[PDB]
Amino acid sequence: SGSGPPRKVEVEPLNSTAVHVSWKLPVPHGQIRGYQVTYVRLENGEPRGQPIIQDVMLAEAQETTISGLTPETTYSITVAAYTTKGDGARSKPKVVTTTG
Ligand SMILES: OC[C@@H](O)[C@@H](O)[C@H](O)[C@@H](O)CO
């Protein structure tokens, strides 16, 4: 509502407990104050447990590392901007599974 989604979200695995998430600026709305990276464990494709929100509270932000993940575990990741007119649209989920 406050903005379109972050564009070209990418996930790069780092190790069995961490992945690197990056994105491009939403299409130029409210003014961007930061980004909300949300991830949730999936079990057989279904979300399980509370989603975890990692705030990246720089308007210039375009990346963050999610760490403390469990090995051999599947996660669904979305990104949304925080704006002066409320949350932006969330990106479509990107789903990855950590190595062993
Ligand atoms: O489709 C993959 C499967 O559901 C698995 O990766 C779970 O996320 C993991 O077993 C968590 O216990």
Q: What is the resolution of this structure in A?
A: 1.7
Q: Name residue 20's amino acid.
A: H
Q: Which atom of ligand 1 is nearest to the CA of 72?
A: 6
- Experimental technique used to determine this entry: X-ray
89 CB contacts (<8 Å, ≥6 apart)?
Answer: 1, 3, 4, 5, 26, 80
Task: Give the closest residue to 36 by CA, choosing from 24, 16, 52, 15.
Answer: 52
Is residue 50 in contact with ligand 1, taking CB distance under 6 Å?
no
Query: Can you say whether the dihedral through the CA atoms of 44, 46, 52, 57 is positive or negative?
Result: positive
Provide the b/e sequence for 11-22 (b: ≥16 CB within 10 Å). beeeeeeebebb
Class level of CATH domain 7-98: mainly beta
Domain boundaries, the chain: 7-98
| Contact call for residues 22 and 91 (beta carbons, < 8 A) | no
* Ligand 1 mean position, distance from CA 39 (Å): 14
Q: Which atom of ligand 1 is nearest to the CA of 74?
A: 8
